[PDB]
Amino acid sequence: DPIIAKQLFSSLFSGILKEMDKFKTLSEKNNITQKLLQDFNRFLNTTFSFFPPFVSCIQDISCQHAALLSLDPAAVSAGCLASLQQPVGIRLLEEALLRPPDVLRWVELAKLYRSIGEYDVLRGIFTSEIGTKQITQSALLAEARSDYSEAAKQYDEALNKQDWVDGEPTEAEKDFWELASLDCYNHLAEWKSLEYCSTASIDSENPPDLNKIWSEPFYQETYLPYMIRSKLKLLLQGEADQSLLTFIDKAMHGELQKAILELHYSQELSLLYLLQDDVDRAKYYIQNGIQSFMQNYSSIDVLLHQSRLTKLQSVQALTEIQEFISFISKQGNLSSQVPLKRLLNTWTNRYPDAKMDPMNIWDDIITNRCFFLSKIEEKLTPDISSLIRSCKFSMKMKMIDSARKQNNFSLAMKLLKELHKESKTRDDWLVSWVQSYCRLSHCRSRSQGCSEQVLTVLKTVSLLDENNVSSYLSKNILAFRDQNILLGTTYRIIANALSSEPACLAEIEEDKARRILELDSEKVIAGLYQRAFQHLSEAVQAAEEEAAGVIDAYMTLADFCDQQLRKEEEQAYPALVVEKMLKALKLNSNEARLKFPRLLQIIERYPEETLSLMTKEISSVPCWQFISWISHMVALLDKDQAVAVQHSVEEITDNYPQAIVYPFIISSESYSFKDTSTGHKNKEFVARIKSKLDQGGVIQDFINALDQLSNPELLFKDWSNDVRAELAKTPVNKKNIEKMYERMYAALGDPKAPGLGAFRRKFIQTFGKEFDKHFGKGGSKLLRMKLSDFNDITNMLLLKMNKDSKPPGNLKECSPWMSDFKVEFLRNELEIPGQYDGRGKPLPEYHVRIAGFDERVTVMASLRRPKRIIIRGHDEREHPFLVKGGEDLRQDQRVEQLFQVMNGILAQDSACSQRALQLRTYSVVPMTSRLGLIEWLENTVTLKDLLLNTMSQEEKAAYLSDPRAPPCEYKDWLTKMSGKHDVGAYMLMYKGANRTETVTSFRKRESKVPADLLKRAFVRMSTSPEAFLALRSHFASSHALICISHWILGIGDRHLNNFMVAMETGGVIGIDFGHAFGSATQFLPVPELMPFRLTRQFINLMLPMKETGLMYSIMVHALRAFRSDPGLLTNTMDVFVKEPSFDWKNFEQKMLKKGGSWIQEINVAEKNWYPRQKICYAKRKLAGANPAVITCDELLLGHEKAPAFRDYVAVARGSKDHNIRAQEPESGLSEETQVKCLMDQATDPNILGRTWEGWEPWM
């Protein structure tokens, strides 16, 4: 076995070199390591058969020793690029670039990263702080998008330049320009500019190639593959030009020129000898190629994917060569065309996969097949001259349809202009031609600015409305649906283009303005919207004669009319949206399942008609597609338009009586119906479902038993604050105190009031048996007290009720209903919650039932002190859940539902699905008010505990027990800067230290922690350099995703225990959304001014690069996908304004008096003032806003009339000398500039030097 030989040799070598360091003192071992370094250089420079577990064998033992690290940047790259072992060479060069710029290694590392895609990391490489020119970054930007015709232009316009008055463009960068221009000419089909550029650098005046490539082994590893590839791919058609066969013949006389060919090529050789009309040598060469594929593919390592994919992507060309050899040899399949038709019918169904195979593979297979067909047309001499062209046309058009999807517009355009001379012969060819043209133009003009984006979609007008209907569009129906849905999008593009910069773009033309006018500054928009509406309506008037082919024709017209209505907000369109969306929701479609609050808002905003239209369409829909919006519908089951919701709530309550149970109790806690004729039907309907649910009370005892184990002090503080915020301000509210005292009367009253309604605790039977000598005075005077002045009498008893308590109950006998749960009868086993996640038929038989609880309940040491229970399933498996005492967990549910909408909109965007970006969520149920459950996560650990267990024993001891530690140094700095030990020092410190004091102390506090903690934690558990590059990249991508997604809905308090890392995949999980919109910079005493957490460890993980290559392009991609359609998240955000939670009402009174924002009307509560303001703030920062403008706006709304307020606005705005966020406009920003100033605000020592001490900004 080769692989265990590689692992045994690489273990034994390292073992001997690590054991020799006892004796053999320091003057001899230096010479030993120098000789070993020269031997390894000799191996890498003289090898010619790049065997993978030998090439990647010496680079694993060299990159671990400090003496062999300076090995050979020019041979390492050329070996790893050819043996496909690139994650070992990347780690070798990145360990060399640690420990004048090192432009050689900085160019070879870029050449290793460029070969496997990975254009994200190539932004933190090519800067001007390593002496590289600025023609490299501008040319890599045109290759990060598939635009290999401007980069191949401005590489040629940078090679032959002699001015260079900044320095000198060194020879390593010129080798990089030559290699990258070679690949950019390779990615197209220019087979003259790859031939001349490859045979015009070794000799002059028509080079012979005959021995010039075989000397000086740098001109052989680079200039030979492109020479033979360009010459062969030009040989496979056209004229003779006999100059490669003679080179092969005079090369094969040697030995090292004979075992370098036919070991690395074999396939170009087989094609070259098939070109010479002999099949016998090609048989030997293709058998050699098959054996070479097998011996190479069985040798590259196990956990090294995409090398296996790029090696497996050649088997179709190999076996098509073998099938042509086997077809042409026999005689029974060369007389009759019956085995020919089976070949032409099996060729047109064996394409490679579109969107997943690069265009060199498609070019290989298509040119091979046309060469084979041209040979078979002569060898099969006994209408047959048409059935091959009808195969070649439909083989090239699929290649075009895959070149369009990968943004190869410059490659697809020449294929269109070559497939045009013989397209007008028949009739069903032209429609596919013009539709490929029109889809190419619509895909191409998504990036141009204006006035040329108008011009290309104006050019694809005159051919879409050609004759084209000579019994074809009337007869066929797909060719009639597709031209209508294309001609709708053309006019939509024009009329949306002339509506941002209206006047000038209709003026910068000479005849195209008249051509647009034949289809004043408002007729040319309204008459084009009408022409869009006609061609989008025909696409469903003529497509109801037949899924996934009518869902697009529905949802196109639905989204166009919905955006037109949202533009009218600032005919029968609100009627036309609802039925065309519900007909596509009836068929299975996830893109219409998330557009439900748009319907439930258009019904509320347009109720004069279309409210009867929702009834007949919601009547016949399978009622498992609303289990996402059950909490969205049970809040509409209090107010008007409850019809067309009532039927679906009744159906779900009938046939799924476990999904809608728990969202019904929270809405039944507070309804307060009206007094009309409909207001009585609403009460009888809610009373019918209240009688129908709970099936005899198996749910209510579960909810009560999970209520009766929490600490009573939390509900005690709830009662105390609810009476203090209702009596001690003004006694005008009638019956409210005597109504809110009933819960205090029921629970924690006389010790039998819980004993008669529920089960007696083992802890309340000690608590209420002691708190009755203090409850006698309550039963005397506090029943009708109405004094409203004294609260110290409550203060002394709440301070005395925290001494003789024990919040551990120490077993599950503290709530003796689950310890004696003991199911024995079919009493509707109650199906452990948090299931029915969204879509599909739920299949409720596979769902886990509750069959008991454990005796070990534990307590988490947070503020509100939640508990954790271990509930056992019926199949004997534990489930950990987290019960919370008395907080309304509906904001957590709403933001996790928002995360579900977020990673539903991520998977539709094409650029993010290739990176596989998904937010990882978890389940939360608000059972009743002041009671919920949270799914505890297994196999994870907190980020702070990972960083606190990665250190050494001398590190944590001198980090926690040191007077100069960054914990104590920040406290001493705050004492010195202000004068006081408590809070208020944060107020006076803004009026204390200036800018150039905070930074100079922050670097001293920051450079006292170790700098390699995430790298140590990721190298302790990776076991391979091919896996380190996977784990660290996955960690960085997941953290970039949650950093950009915790800002749109503005989440604060991102401290060091809100991040969970999975110890089996290396990915970050964000939790604990207590502050969800801007409420850490608005209601906290000392504010927070950063948008997310990007501290020193997250940027020190990515050395020798920094956080501008990988943690930048992920944020650009995710935020561009969010700002693709901005309507979805703001439409989901209206459940806050429909049924507002208590957390948006306990501070609404605080903003009512001690706050700001008097520009808007404050007389209306929770319909226009609070949640409409949070929605308009998120809509502003989703339409493009400065991240320092939103912070000072939220700081003006909540922190005005402060002592240090202008200091707050001065800190969080910029400085115009260090910060890019001060040199930008306040609004109307762009995407990359917005994320640039966004990442500028996060890492700022003028911000991070002055924050709250528990956020820990130094680590």
CA angle at 465 for the pair 463 and 468, rounded to the nearest 5° = 85
- DSSP annotation of 1221 reads G
Cis, peptide link before residue 1104, omega less than 30° from 0:
yes
Residue found by looking up tokens 């060199």 in the block: 360
Of 248, 250, 285, 293, which is closest to residue 267 (Cα–Cα)?
285
- As a three-state string, the secondary structure of 1102-1148 is CCCCCCCCHHHHHHHHHHHHHCCCCHHHHHHCCHHHHCCCHHHCCCH
Q: Bridge partners of 80? A: none
Cβ atoms 944, 1057 nearer than 8 A: yes
Burial of 1201 (0-12, 13-18, 19+ CB in 10 A): exposed
Of 796, 787, 797, which is closest to residue 748 (Cα–Cα)?
797
Burial of 800 (0-12, 13-18, 19+ CB in 10 A): exposed
Residue found by looking up tokens 């040329």 in the block: 452
Cβ atoms 812, 853 nearer than 8 A: yes
Cβ atoms 378, 369 nearer than 8 A: no
- Whole-number Å distance between alpha carbons of 742 and 51: 81
Cβ atoms 1064, 939 nearer than 8 A: yes
Q: Is the dihedral of CA 502, 508, 511, 512 positive or negative?
A: negative
- Alpha-helical runs (H) found in 426-545: 430-444, 453-459, 478-497, 502-505, 512-517, 523-541
Residue type, 808: P
Cβ atoms 232, 268 nearer than 8 A: yes
Cβ atoms 574, 558 nearer than 8 A: no
3-state secondary structure (DSSP) of residue 806: coil
Of 673, 670, 722, which is closest to residue 1149 (Cα–Cα)?
722
Domain ranges (residues) in the chain: 262-303+311-377, 414-546, 940-1126+1183-1248
Phi-psi region of 717 (alpha: psi -120 to 50; beta: other; left: phi over 0): alpha
Q: Kindly provide the resolution of this structure in angstroms, with one decimal.
A: 3.3
Q: Report residue 858: phi and psi, to 5°.
A: -120, 165
| Per-position b or e across 557-571, b if 16+ CB within 10 A of its CB | bbbbbbebbeeeeee
Contacts of 552 (CB under 8 A, 6+ apart): 485
Of 361, 366, 346, 372, which is closest to residue 282 (Cα–Cα)?
372
Q: How determined?
A: cryo-EM
- DSSP annotation of 477 reads S
Contacts of 745 (CB under 8 A, 6+ apart): 753
- Count of CB atoms situated within 10 Å of the CB of 991: 12
Of 629, 1180, 601, 595, which is closest to residue 908 (Cα–Cα)?
595
Contacts of 1031 (CB under 8 A, 6+ apart): 1018, 1021, 1022, 1066
- Whole-number Å distance between alpha carbons of 1172 and 1161: 11
Six-digit token pair at 477?
């129906």
- Whole-number Å distance between alpha carbons of 122 and 144: 9
Residue found by looking up tokens 């509707």 in the block: 828
- Whole-number Å distance between alpha carbons of 650 and 618: 12
Q: Is the dihedral of CA 650, 656, 661, 664 positive or negative?
A: negative
Q: Which secondary-structure segment (H or E) carries 926? A: strand 924-928
Written as one string, the DSSP assignment of 859-894 is E--SSS--EEEEEEETTS-EEEEEEESS--THHHHH
How much is the CA Rg of the chain, to the nearest whole Å? 36
Burial of 352 (0-12, 13-18, 19+ CB in 10 A): middle
Q: Is the dihedral of CA 518, 522, 528, 533 positive or negative?
A: negative
Q: Is the dihedral of CA 27, 29, 33, 38 positive or negative?
A: positive
Q: Is the dihedral of CA 403, 404, 408, 411 positive or negative?
A: positive
Q: Bridge partners of 933? A: 883, 925
3-state secondary structure (DSSP) of residue 1182: helix
- Count of CB atoms situated within 10 Å of the CB of 373: 18
Written as one string, the DSSP assignment of 125-175 is SSSTTTT--STTHHHHHHHHTT-TTTTTHHHHHHHS----TTS---HHHHH
- DSSP annotation of 353 reads P
Of 27, 18, 90, which is closest to residue 1030 (Cα–Cα)?
90
- Whole-number Å distance between alpha carbons of 232 and 1178: 58
- Whole-number Å distance between alpha carbons of 452 and 652: 53
- Whole-number Å distance between alpha carbons of 974 and 1251: 11
- Whole-number Å distance between alpha carbons of 1249 and 1251: 6
Q: Which secondary-structure segment (H or E) carries 552? A: helix 551-569
- Whole-number Å distance between alpha carbons of 360 and 1194: 54
| Per-position b or e across 33-71, b if 16+ CB within 10 A of its CB | eeebbeebeeebeeeeebebbbbbbbbbbbbbeeebbeb
Cα 558 to chain centroid distance, Å, stands at 27
Six-digit token pair at 790?
């004294």
Q: How far is the CA of 459 from the CAs of 410, 481, 490, 669, 1235, in angstroms?
A: 17, 21, 10, 62, 35
Burial of 902 (0-12, 13-18, 19+ CB in 10 A): buried
Cα 459 to chain centroid distance, Å, stands at 36
Q: How far is the CA of 888 from the CAs of 107, 746, 1180, 1199, in angstroms?
A: 56, 20, 28, 26
Cα 894 to chain centroid distance, Å, stands at 20
Q: Bridge partners of 867? A: 859, 883
Residue type, 621: V
Contacts of 176 (CB under 8 A, 6+ apart): 107, 110, 111, 136
